[PDB]
DNA sequence: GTGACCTGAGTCAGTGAGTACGCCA
DNA sequence: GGCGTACTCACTGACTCAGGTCAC
């Protein structure tokens, strides 16, 4: 957490610091991730303070050509502890690749919210369970968040108390504004919420309800792309696992197809697939990942705890 | 391959040469390549100083009319870094020419970063396997550069695990402005070396999330043109391949076209479309190349690297 | 044509002829075309000197009216260069005409470079079959010169060998001032030897990438007008077939119009819109030509060249 | 042979750029 | 297999002539 408040000590005007904090941006990394074009439109920042803040931000962080040795060493802060029920974290080697946009693009009845609760609990798994991690956020656009499931999966992982594992943000969207403000206040600049989980339950569901037809596609997807960029910037800020879900559409043209299309196809790092099949048990895929190979898995929910 | 300070050794004022060095010109070609307008825009340079700088620059480097057979004998050595797949480096004649800019685009899960990952390693190779006898300076904006592959690459090529990572230069470049900036830092830090492959993985991932909406589109494409022209400058200046990769959007008629419009369409020399095929096997196509004919590959993304 | 120092040997003092030799006036036709306002601003020459050199040049070069009947005699023996395709041949009424500016624009992968490459070899074919029997100059601005593709054309028509790469002269413009300066250097290489093609592989790519905004819009259109003026001077004093190449831009208001605006739109006698057709086969439609219809035709790019 | 004085009058336009964005049984 | 809508960007500079009137 290297925020705009620590930027004050660098010699930056306090008034401009607060007038940037009142905007979306909250950290030196945030402005260093935005052009001069985005800084030019903040009222009270006029074409000179923006540039000098750009130079100060560029000098403050080592945002230059490295050799990636340090990048592999930074891989150590990143843990994939998605245990689930069976064959998670073994065949699906990367369940939570912190710093990457995991995307459970799946189907109804195939346990996307259930696995989201599992993921939220596992991101709170202590150091003894293969690494201890924090928790910062949960978006509930479709209004399906039952912390009773959190308690049930807590008992699965050996957690007696689930109120400690109660996710720090039960925010909801109600519309396409993707909960603008929480990305801004919850920039996770405190001492907690480091290597946390940022769940967006049905991130682009509301983009389907509110935004409608071809007449609103451009605005819908540009809003979506700005939102996904905000997610990616949040992930780049320290390290956080951006785990989102998504629903399928039906290809009447002549069986799942992306919703959000190529914006979410390219934005998300490790995109994922879920299937029901036969019996109670359901199948997944390992689908997109620059590191993992295509494969399938095998899992089932229980009442006293859930896998995938 | 002649450092800019050598013009000072000719007799040009030391203050002028250093102020040009921090002006974005780090080779005797950098000053010669640009027009007088950019040199004039530099602080401390008048019209006369710029004119004498241009004359002394044109004195050294041959800006003349060499017959096409001279260029053909220059074309005997092209290096043509191999791809790793027998069919892929057969569709490409010998590979990809060094000294021209190549672009790879496709939908998700098409192995653009896979081709980059298994084609940058093939540059720090003896020419016996179509190597380049150079290094890499992979630049990557989305963080698709997952280090697990980055250190699981080297088991097939015949090289140790130490001298693959130690021969790449990775930064992030999480801005539209940071792309050209990183190009400048790369030029000034790699003039004193012998590189064979500069990779700009996602040239246009950052020209969507950043410059949102029309009206803001023209500045987006002007910045893209600036970046692409400086990119092309690194080809004549250092004789390297500068492979970039692209993305797609749904061309809603009311399904596959590259982003960047007609600015990335023209600057690129060779354009490769990667598409998911029947099963794990991929399909590559020659979209837009000056010498290469249109044909399809069938390369398969294997664990060691792109094979067939 | 006659070189600059022809009447000077018995006329003006050789010193001022060598003084104006730096100003890029390497033929007495060029001095004839010269405005007095553009000769007062060069060093050495006074009012009386400028007037006397202009009177001498006007004595050497015809300047007034001429009955269109005799100019029809000139136009009946001009040479039209074969394009390399049989169907493009009749479409362009004998192919690319000489002594005038021709401009083919289009999106990528439309074969604009490919037609120029085949034009560079068909520049040397005999008078009974090919275009002008002369050395082909290839001022190139994108680096997409492929001598290999030149050869494949040489196998056809039975002019194989590197004897076609010796005739072709290849420059490489690196900016706008230099692309303009290269026409001063190219000015003297055509008064001493026969050249029959003035391919500027992209007339406007560097204008697009050099002058950034709207503040530079008046400047760049002025400079481009000057460049097209010297192009027209070359075309109408050497009788070379200038073949410039234009890119495209996308209309956002409502769909691909060429870049350059009302300057190059008016100042490019013949315009072609090459468009991709189906498969490997592309289409060439006429856009703006004062003497041939606005139809559209067919062609394709093979491993041999741009033929059927 | 001696002996300086007095400011008026405005002008004349030019240059286009730049695509995005899936949907539904 | 019948489905549309979205707008903002700016800098440019060189220019000349004209005179004529007196007494102590
Ligand atoms: N506690 C449980 N025990 C066993 N099976 C369960 C349990 N909870 C849910 N399930 C099963 O898992 C499915 C959950 O599907 P899920 O995709 O999470 O629901 P949804 O309504 O599609 N939510 P979302 O996809 O986030 O919009 C249910 O339909 C049941 O078949
Ligand atoms: N070890 C491996 N063995 C086999 N296949 C692998 C292996 N690692 C990666 N792959 C495959 O390579 C594919 C390419 O990854 P991909 O999703 O294209 O990365 P990306 O190019 O960064 N994504 P995008 O930007 O959407 O193209 C994966 O989906 C796997 O199918
Ligand atoms: N040997 C060949 N055989 C057949 N077709 C070929 C061959 N070489 C190139 N082509 C075709 O020519 C196309 C390229 O045309 P080109 O003239 O390079 O377009 P351009 O618009 O000038 N390129 P850019 O630099 O992106 O503007 C390729 O996409 C192929 O379709
Ligand atoms: Mg469900
Ligand atoms: Mg890919
Ligand atoms: Mg071309």
Coordinates of N, CA and C in Angstrom, one line a residue, chain C residues 29-189:
Chain C
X29 N 14.9 22.1 -66.0 CA 13.5 22.1 -65.9 C 13.1 22.5 -64.5
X30 N 13.8 22.0 -63.5 CA 13.4 22.4 -62.1 C 13.6 23.9 -61.9
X31 N 14.6 24.5 -62.4 CA 14.8 26.0 -62.3 C 13.7 26.7 -63.1
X32 N 13.3 26.1 -64.2 CA 12.2 26.7 -65.0 C 10.9 26.8 -64.1
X33 N 10.6 25.7 -63.4 CA 9.4 25.5 -62.6 C 9.5 26.4 -61.3
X34 N 10.6 26.9 -61.0 CA 10.9 27.5 -59.7 C 10.2 28.9 -59.7
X35 N 9.5 29.2 -58.6 CA 9.0 30.6 -58.4 C 10.1 31.5 -57.8
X36 N 10.0 32.7 -58.3 CA 11.0 33.8 -57.8 C 10.9 33.9 -56.3
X37 N 9.8 33.8 -55.7 CA 9.6 33.9 -54.3 C 10.4 32.8 -53.6
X38 N 10.5 31.7 -54.2 CA 11.3 30.6 -53.6 C 12.8 30.6 -54.0
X39 N 13.2 31.6 -54.8 CA 14.6 31.7 -55.2 C 15.2 33.0 -54.5
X40 N 14.4 33.9 -54.1 CA 14.9 35.1 -53.4 C 15.4 34.6 -52.0
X41 N 14.8 33.6 -51.4 CA 15.1 33.2 -50.0 C 16.3 32.4 -49.9
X42 N 17.0 32.0 -51.0 CA 18.2 31.2 -51.0 C 19.4 32.2 -51.1
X43 N 20.5 31.8 -50.5 CA 21.6 32.7 -50.4 C 22.3 33.0 -51.8
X44 N 22.9 34.1 -51.9 CA 23.7 34.5 -53.1 C 22.9 35.1 -54.2
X45 N 21.8 34.5 -54.6 CA 21.1 35.0 -55.8 C 20.3 36.3 -55.4
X46 N 20.5 37.3 -56.3 CA 19.9 38.6 -56.1 C 18.6 38.7 -57.0
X47 N 18.0 39.9 -57.0 CA 16.8 40.1 -57.9 C 17.2 39.9 -59.3
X48 N 18.3 40.6 -59.8 CA 18.7 40.6 -61.2 C 19.1 39.2 -61.5
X49 N 19.9 38.5 -60.6 CA 20.4 37.2 -60.9 C 19.2 36.2 -61.1
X50 N 18.2 36.3 -60.2 CA 17.0 35.4 -60.2 C 16.3 35.7 -61.5
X51 N 16.1 37.0 -61.9 CA 15.4 37.3 -63.1 C 16.1 36.7 -64.4
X52 N 17.4 36.9 -64.4 CA 18.1 36.4 -65.6 C 18.2 34.9 -65.7
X53 N 18.3 34.2 -64.5 CA 18.3 32.7 -64.6 C 16.9 32.2 -64.9
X54 N 15.8 32.9 -64.5 CA 14.5 32.5 -64.9 C 14.3 32.7 -66.4
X55 N 14.8 33.8 -66.9 CA 14.6 34.1 -68.3 C 15.4 33.0 -69.2
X56 N 16.6 32.7 -68.7 CA 17.3 31.6 -69.4 C 16.6 30.3 -69.4
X57 N 16.1 29.9 -68.2 CA 15.4 28.6 -68.0 C 14.1 28.6 -68.9
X58 N 13.4 29.8 -68.9 CA 12.2 29.8 -69.7 C 12.5 29.8 -71.2
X59 N 13.7 30.3 -71.6 CA 14.2 30.1 -73.0 C 14.4 28.6 -73.3
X60 N 15.0 27.9 -72.3 CA 15.3 26.5 -72.6 C 14.1 25.6 -72.5
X61 N 13.2 25.9 -71.6 CA 12.0 25.1 -71.3 C 10.8 25.7 -71.9
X62 N 10.0 25.0 -72.7 CA 8.7 25.6 -73.1 C 7.8 25.8 -71.9
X63 N 7.1 26.9 -71.9 CA 6.3 27.3 -70.8 C 4.9 27.8 -71.0
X64 N 4.6 28.3 -72.2 CA 3.3 28.8 -72.5 C 2.2 27.8 -72.9
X65 N 1.3 28.3 -73.7 CA 0.2 27.4 -74.2 C 0.6 26.4 -75.2
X66 N -0.1 25.4 -75.5 CA 0.1 24.5 -76.6 C -1.3 23.9 -77.0
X67 N -1.5 23.8 -78.3 CA -2.8 23.2 -78.8 C -2.9 21.8 -78.3
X68 N -4.1 21.4 -77.8 CA -4.3 20.1 -77.3 C -4.1 19.0 -78.3
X69 N -4.1 19.4 -79.6 CA -3.8 18.4 -80.7 C -2.4 17.9 -80.6
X70 N -1.4 18.8 -80.5 CA 0.0 18.4 -80.3 C 0.3 17.7 -79.0
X71 N -0.4 18.2 -77.9 CA -0.3 17.5 -76.7 C -1.0 16.2 -76.7
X72 N -1.9 16.0 -77.6 CA -2.4 14.6 -77.9 C -1.4 13.8 -78.5
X73 N -0.5 14.4 -79.4 CA 0.6 13.6 -79.9 C 1.5 13.1 -78.8
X74 N 1.8 14.0 -77.9 CA 2.6 13.5 -76.7 C 1.9 12.4 -75.9
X75 N 0.6 12.6 -75.7 CA -0.1 11.6 -74.8 C -0.4 10.3 -75.5
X76 N -0.3 10.3 -76.9 CA -0.5 9.0 -77.6 C 0.7 8.1 -77.6
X77 N 1.9 8.7 -77.2 CA 3.1 7.9 -77.1 C 3.6 7.8 -75.7
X78 N 2.9 8.1 -74.7 CA 3.2 7.8 -73.3 C 3.1 6.4 -73.1
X79 N 3.7 5.8 -72.1 CA 3.8 4.4 -71.8 C 3.0 4.1 -70.6
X80 N 2.1 3.1 -70.6 CA 1.4 2.6 -69.5 C 2.0 1.3 -69.0
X81 N 2.3 1.2 -67.8 CA 3.1 0.0 -67.2 C 2.1 -1.1 -66.9
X82 N 2.4 -2.3 -67.3 CA 1.6 -3.4 -67.0 C 1.6 -3.7 -65.5
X83 N 0.4 -4.0 -64.9 CA 0.2 -4.2 -63.5 C 0.6 -5.6 -63.0
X84 N 0.7 -6.5 -63.9 CA 0.9 -7.9 -63.5 C -0.3 -8.8 -63.5
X85 N -1.5 -8.2 -63.6 CA -2.7 -8.9 -63.7 C -3.5 -8.6 -65.0
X86 N -4.1 -9.6 -65.6 CA -4.7 -9.4 -66.9 C -6.0 -8.6 -66.7
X87 N -6.7 -8.9 -65.6 CA -8.0 -8.2 -65.3 C -7.8 -6.7 -64.8
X88 N -6.7 -6.5 -64.0 CA -6.4 -5.1 -63.7 C -5.9 -4.3 -64.9
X89 N -5.4 -5.0 -65.9 CA -4.9 -4.3 -67.1 C -6.0 -3.5 -67.8
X90 N -7.1 -4.2 -68.1 CA -8.2 -3.4 -68.8 C -8.9 -2.4 -67.9
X91 N -8.9 -2.8 -66.6 CA -9.6 -1.9 -65.6 C -8.8 -0.5 -65.5
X92 N -7.5 -0.5 -65.5 CA -6.7 0.7 -65.5 C -6.4 1.2 -66.9
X93 N -7.0 0.7 -67.9 CA -6.8 1.1 -69.3 C -5.4 1.1 -69.7
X94 N -4.8 -0.1 -69.6 CA -3.4 -0.4 -69.9 C -2.5 -0.3 -68.7
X95 N -3.1 -0.3 -67.5 CA -2.2 -0.4 -66.3 C -1.9 1.0 -65.8
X96 N -0.8 1.1 -65.0 CA -0.4 2.3 -64.3 C 0.2 3.2 -65.3
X97 N -0.3 4.4 -65.5 CA 0.1 5.4 -66.5 C 1.4 6.1 -66.0
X98 N 2.1 6.7 -66.9 CA 3.4 7.3 -66.6 C 3.3 8.8 -66.8
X99 N 4.2 9.5 -66.1 CA 4.2 11.0 -66.2 C 3.1 11.6 -65.3
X100 N 2.5 10.9 -64.4 CA 1.5 11.4 -63.5 C 1.4 10.7 -62.2
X101 N 0.8 11.3 -61.2 CA 0.7 10.6 -59.9 C -0.5 9.6 -59.9
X102 N -0.2 8.4 -59.5 CA -1.2 7.4 -59.3 C -1.2 7.0 -57.8
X103 N -2.3 6.8 -57.2 CA -2.4 6.5 -55.8 C -3.4 5.3 -55.6
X104 N -3.0 4.2 -55.0 CA -3.8 3.1 -54.6 C -3.9 3.1 -53.1
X105 N -5.1 3.2 -52.6 CA -5.4 3.1 -51.2 C -6.2 1.9 -50.9
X106 N -6.2 1.5 -49.6 CA -7.0 0.3 -49.2 C -6.5 -0.1 -47.8
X107 N -7.4 -0.9 -47.2 CA -7.0 -1.5 -45.9 C -5.9 -2.4 -46.1
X108 N -5.4 -3.0 -45.0 CA -4.3 -4.0 -45.0 C -4.7 -5.2 -45.9
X109 N -3.7 -6.0 -46.2 CA -3.9 -7.3 -46.9 C -4.6 -7.1 -48.3
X110 N -4.6 -5.9 -48.8 CA -5.2 -5.7 -50.1 C -4.2 -5.7 -51.3
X111 N -2.9 -6.0 -51.0 CA -2.0 -6.1 -52.1 C -1.5 -4.8 -52.6
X112 N -1.4 -3.7 -51.8 CA -0.9 -2.4 -52.3 C 0.6 -2.5 -52.5
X113 N 1.3 -3.1 -51.5 CA 2.8 -3.4 -51.7 C 3.0 -4.4 -52.8
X114 N 2.2 -5.4 -52.8 CA 2.4 -6.5 -53.8 C 2.3 -6.0 -55.2
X115 N 1.4 -5.1 -55.5 CA 1.3 -4.5 -56.9 C 2.5 -3.7 -57.2
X116 N 3.0 -2.9 -56.2 CA 4.2 -2.1 -56.4 C 5.4 -3.0 -56.6
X117 N 5.6 -4.1 -55.9 CA 6.7 -5.0 -56.2 C 6.7 -5.6 -57.6
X118 N 5.5 -6.0 -58.0 CA 5.4 -6.5 -59.4 C 5.6 -5.4 -60.4
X119 N 5.2 -4.2 -60.1 CA 5.4 -3.0 -60.9 C 6.9 -2.7 -61.0
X120 N 7.6 -2.9 -59.9 CA 9.1 -2.7 -59.9 C 9.8 -3.6 -60.9
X121 N 9.3 -4.8 -61.1 CA 9.9 -5.7 -62.1 C 9.4 -5.5 -63.5
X122 N 8.1 -5.2 -63.6 CA 7.5 -4.9 -64.9 C 7.9 -3.5 -65.4
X123 N 8.5 -2.7 -64.5 CA 9.2 -1.5 -65.0 C 10.3 -1.8 -66.0
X124 N 10.9 -3.0 -66.0 CA 12.1 -3.3 -66.8 C 11.7 -4.1 -68.0
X125 N 10.5 -4.6 -68.2 CA 10.1 -5.4 -69.3 C 10.2 -4.7 -70.6
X126 N 10.5 -5.3 -71.7 CA 10.7 -4.6 -73.0 C 9.5 -3.8 -73.4
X127 N 9.7 -3.0 -74.5 CA 8.6 -2.0 -74.9 C 7.4 -2.7 -75.4
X128 N 7.6 -3.9 -76.0 CA 6.5 -4.6 -76.7 C 5.6 -5.2 -75.7
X129 N 6.0 -5.4 -74.4 CA 5.2 -6.2 -73.5 C 5.1 -5.5 -72.1
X130 N 6.1 -4.6 -71.7 CA 6.2 -4.2 -70.4 C 6.4 -2.7 -70.3
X131 N 6.4 -2.2 -69.0 CA 6.4 -0.8 -68.6 C 7.6 0.0 -68.6
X132 N 8.1 0.5 -69.7 CA 9.1 1.6 -69.7 C 10.5 1.2 -69.8
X133 N 10.9 -0.1 -69.6 CA 12.2 -0.6 -69.9 C 13.3 0.2 -69.2
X134 N 13.0 0.6 -67.9 CA 13.9 1.4 -67.2 C 14.1 1.0 -65.8
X135 N 15.2 1.5 -65.2 CA 15.5 1.3 -63.8 C 14.3 1.8 -62.9
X136 N 14.0 1.0 -61.9 CA 12.9 1.4 -61.0 C 13.3 1.8 -59.7
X137 N 12.9 3.1 -59.3 CA 13.3 3.6 -58.0 C 12.1 3.3 -57.0
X138 N 12.5 3.0 -55.8 CA 11.6 2.5 -54.8 C 11.8 3.2 -53.4
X139 N 11.6 4.5 -53.4 CA 11.6 5.2 -52.2 C 10.6 4.5 -51.3
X140 N 11.0 4.0 -50.2 CA 10.2 3.1 -49.3 C 10.2 3.7 -47.9
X141 N 9.0 3.7 -47.3 CA 8.9 4.4 -46.0 C 8.4 3.5 -44.9
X142 N 8.1 2.2 -45.2 CA 7.6 1.3 -44.2 C 8.5 0.1 -43.9
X143 N 9.5 -0.1 -44.7 CA 10.4 -1.2 -44.6 C 9.9 -2.5 -45.1
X144 N 8.8 -2.4 -45.9 CA 8.2 -3.6 -46.5 C 8.7 -3.9 -47.9
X145 N 10.0 -3.5 -48.1 CA 10.6 -3.9 -49.4 C 11.1 -5.4 -49.3
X146 N 10.6 -6.2 -50.2 CA 11.0 -7.6 -50.3 C 11.7 -7.9 -51.6
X147 N 13.0 -7.9 -51.7 CA 13.6 -8.3 -52.9 C 13.3 -9.7 -53.3
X148 N 12.9 -10.6 -52.4 CA 12.5 -12.0 -52.7 C 11.3 -12.0 -53.6
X149 N 10.3 -11.2 -53.3 CA 9.1 -11.1 -54.1 C 9.4 -10.5 -55.4
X150 N 10.4 -9.6 -55.5 CA 10.8 -9.2 -56.8 C 11.3 -10.3 -57.7
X151 N 12.0 -11.3 -57.2 CA 12.5 -12.4 -58.0 C 11.4 -13.2 -58.5
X152 N 10.4 -13.5 -57.7 CA 9.3 -14.4 -58.2 C 8.6 -13.8 -59.4
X153 N 8.5 -12.5 -59.5 CA 8.0 -11.8 -60.7 C 9.0 -12.0 -61.9
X154 N 10.3 -12.0 -61.6 CA 11.3 -12.2 -62.7 C 11.2 -13.6 -63.3
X155 N 11.0 -14.6 -62.6 CA 10.7 -15.9 -63.2 C 9.6 -15.9 -64.2
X156 N 8.5 -15.2 -63.9 CA 7.5 -14.9 -65.0 C 8.1 -13.8 -65.9
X157 N 7.6 -13.8 -67.2 CA 8.0 -13.0 -68.2 C 9.4 -13.3 -68.7
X158 N 10.1 -14.2 -68.1 CA 11.5 -14.6 -68.5 C 12.5 -13.5 -68.4
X159 N 12.5 -12.7 -67.3 CA 13.6 -11.8 -67.0 C 14.2 -12.2 -65.7
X160 N 14.4 -13.5 -65.5 CA 14.9 -13.9 -64.2 C 16.3 -13.4 -63.9
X161 N 16.8 -13.6 -62.7 CA 18.1 -13.3 -62.3 C 18.1 -12.0 -61.4
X162 N 19.3 -11.8 -60.8 CA 19.6 -10.6 -60.0 C 19.9 -9.3 -60.9
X163 N 19.8 -9.5 -62.2 CA 19.9 -8.3 -63.1 C 18.7 -7.4 -63.0
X164 N 17.6 -7.8 -62.3 CA 16.5 -6.9 -62.1 C 16.7 -6.2 -60.7
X165 N 17.5 -6.9 -59.8 CA 17.7 -6.2 -58.6 C 18.8 -5.2 -58.7
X166 N 19.7 -5.3 -59.8 CA 20.7 -4.3 -60.0 C 20.1 -3.0 -60.6
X167 N 19.1 -3.2 -61.5 CA 18.4 -2.1 -62.1 C 17.6 -1.3 -61.0
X168 N 16.9 -2.0 -60.1 CA 16.1 -1.3 -59.1 C 17.0 -0.6 -58.2
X169 N 16.7 0.7 -58.0 CA 17.3 1.5 -57.0 C 16.4 1.7 -55.8
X170 N 16.9 1.5 -54.6 CA 16.1 1.5 -53.4 C 16.5 2.5 -52.4
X171 N 15.7 3.5 -52.1 CA 15.9 4.4 -51.0 C 15.1 4.0 -49.8
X172 N 15.3 4.6 -48.7 CA 14.5 4.3 -47.5 C 14.3 5.6 -46.7
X173 N 13.2 6.3 -47.0 CA 12.8 7.5 -46.2 C 12.5 7.1 -44.8
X174 N 13.1 7.9 -43.9 CA 12.9 7.6 -42.5 C 12.1 8.6 -41.7
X175 N 11.8 9.8 -42.3 CA 10.8 10.8 -41.8 C 10.3 11.6 -42.9
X176 N 9.6 12.7 -42.6 CA 9.0 13.5 -43.7 C 10.0 14.4 -44.3
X177 N 10.8 15.1 -43.5 CA 11.8 16.0 -44.1 C 12.8 15.1 -44.9
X178 N 13.2 14.0 -44.4 CA 14.1 13.1 -45.2 C 13.4 12.5 -46.4
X179 N 12.2 12.1 -46.3 CA 11.5 11.6 -47.5 C 11.3 12.7 -48.6
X180 N 11.3 14.0 -48.1 CA 11.3 15.1 -49.0 C 12.7 15.4 -49.5
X181 N 13.7 15.3 -48.7 CA 15.1 15.4 -49.1 C 15.6 14.3 -50.1
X182 N 15.0 13.1 -49.9 CA 15.4 12.0 -50.8 C 15.0 12.3 -52.2
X183 N 14.1 13.2 -52.4 CA 13.7 13.6 -53.8 C 14.7 14.6 -54.4
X184 N 15.4 15.3 -53.6 CA 16.5 16.1 -54.1 C 17.7 15.1 -54.5
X185 N 18.0 14.2 -53.7 CA 19.0 13.2 -54.1 C 18.5 12.4 -55.3
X186 N 17.3 12.0 -55.3 CA 16.7 11.3 -56.4 C 16.5 12.2 -57.6
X187 N 16.7 13.5 -57.4 CA 16.5 14.4 -58.6 C 17.6 14.3 -59.6
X188 N 18.9 14.1 -59.1 CA 20.0 14.0 -60.0 C 20.3 12.6 -60.5
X189 N 19.7 11.6 -59.9 CA 19.9 10.2 -60.4 C 19.0 9.9 -61.6

